[PDB]
Design a protein around this ligand. Structure first.
Ligand SMILES: O=C(c1ccccc1)c1ccccc1
Length: 149
């Protein structure tokens, strides 16, 4: 039986729009935890991001929607789904529509710390590829996460 709630740290992110994931972009997200509250149909997300190269922390609350998808407001509107779950990782697929109306598809591989299991990494590359995102649009987040624990 799986527990999806708990500490989750980003290892890699892929994006159909590179403007959304480099240095200080809104979706270069360093996850810290995700709590799924199925009783209240909500999800709680805590993570760091950088603006001005300095770490900033966010705690968001999303709403459970149809088909195990969640809606959450952050740099526009987001609809995401936990596409894959193992005992060591989560792969999340997110569609963002920003304030300008531009749509971006992104994937993220999450784990319990810094030591990546290749089996989880191969699944992340396949989900990324399936979403039309090229290999070169993958950023290594563990290498860039120097925000507090
Ligand atoms: O792109 C997101 C994401 C980034 C890394 C892992 C999981 C999800 C995201 C989705 C919804 C809200 C905030 C951030």
């Amino acid at each position: 039986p799986f527990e999806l709630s708990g500490k989750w740290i980003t290892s890699y992110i892929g994006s159909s729009d590179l403007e959304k994931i480099g240095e200080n972009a809104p979706f270069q997200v360093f996850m810290r935890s995700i709590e799924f509250d199925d009783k209240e149909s909500k999800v709680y997300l805590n993570f760091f991001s950088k603006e001005n190269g300095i770490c900033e922390e966010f705690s968001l609350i999303g709403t459970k929607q149809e088909g195990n998808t969640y809606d959450v407001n952050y740099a526009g509107n987001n609809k995401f789904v936990v596409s894959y779950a193992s005992e060591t990782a989560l792969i999340i697929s997110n569609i963002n529509v920003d304030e300008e109306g531009d749509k971006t598809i992104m994937t993220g591989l999450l784990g319990k710390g810094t030591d990546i299991e290749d089996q989880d990494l191969e699944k992340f590359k396949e989900v990324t590829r399936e979403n039309g995102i090229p290999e070169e649009n993958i950023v290594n987040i563990i290498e860039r996460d120097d925000c507090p624990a």
